[PDB]
Amino acid sequence: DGDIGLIIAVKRLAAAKTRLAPVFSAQTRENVVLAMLVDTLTAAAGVGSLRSITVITPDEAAAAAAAGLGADVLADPTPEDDPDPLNTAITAAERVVAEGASNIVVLQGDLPALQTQELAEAISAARHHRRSFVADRLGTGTAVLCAFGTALHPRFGPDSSARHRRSGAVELTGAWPGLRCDVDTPADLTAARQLGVGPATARAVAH
């Protein structure tokens, strides 16, 4: 059955990963972004403790792709001029997901070298606390946020490591390189490739 309700929030592909503009043309950038979500979902989906994967997004291509892999998809009702769009999409998703699970995990969508075991482990350690989170590879942001029988109160965005620490969420400290190594910039993509990215990403970076 599984007890965890997993959320991924995905912004517009047009807007996404501009720091990858140097190494990739517009359509290739969108594709790589979209395939990183595919590889992230795919590996997430092998985790045994999961009940559901919900993707929330205003982007009909990302909607189609997540739906195609057997995820729930929420249309993102965050407003245009919303000051804090990422954390608002996540809360909008939480509100839904929480009708069907006491324990909720938010996962970033840009973790192409994620391994199933990395996520499972992280979740197994998150259970030992109310609110917990995994930092990103460089330390400053956040790869995953975990809430067991309580509100996520997500503080995603810049210095989300520090802000989550302040929020009182406990820093989980497993190595889990593929979970921590998210991809915003060309050097991130290189680090991820050394860990070994999944098939959608590997194909997409070859065009």
CB of 36 to Mg ion, least distance (A): 9
Q: What residues form DSSP beta bridges with 72?
A: 54
How many residues bind to Mg ion according to rule CB under 5 A?
Answer: 5
Q: Which amino acid is at 25?
A: S
**Contact status: 76 vs Mg ion (CB under 5 A):** no
Dihedral pair phi/psi, residue 144, rounded to 5°:
-155, 145
DSSP secondary structure, 91-157, as one string:
HHHHHHHTTS-SEEEEE-S--TT--HHHHHHHHHHHTTSSEEEEE-TTSSSEEEEEEESS------S
- What number of other Cβ atoms are within 10 A of residue 19's Cβ? 13
> What is the rounded (10 degree) CA torsion for 60, 61, 65, 66?
-40
CB of 110 to Mg ion, least distance (A): 4
> What is the rounded (10 degree) CA torsion for 118, 123, 124, 126?
130
CB of 20 to Mg ion, least distance (A): 11
Residues 174-193, one symbol each (x = binds Mg ion by CB under 5 A, - = not), give --------x-x---------
CB of 1 to Mg ion, least distance (A): 31
Comparison of 96 and 184: residue with beta carbon closer to Mg ion: 184
Comparison of 148 and 156: residue with beta carbon closer to Mg ion: 156
**Contact status: 112 vs Mg ion (CB under 5 A):** no
Q: Which pair of structure tokens corresponds to residue 142?
A: 């956040």
Could you give the CA distance from residue 146 to residue 126 in angstroms, rounded to a whole number? Answer: 6
Which of these ranges, 5-13, 43-51, 53-61, 104-112, lies near Mg ion under the rule CB under 5 A? 104-112
**Contact status: 121 vs Mg ion (CB under 5 A):** no
42 is an annotated ligand-binding site residue: no
142 is an annotated ligand-binding site residue: yes
CB of 188 to Mg ion, least distance (A): 7
Binders of Mg ion in range 134-173 (CB under 5 A): 136, 141
Comparison of 37 and 104: residue with beta carbon closer to Mg ion: 37
Binding residues for phosphoenolpyruvate: 142, 157, 160
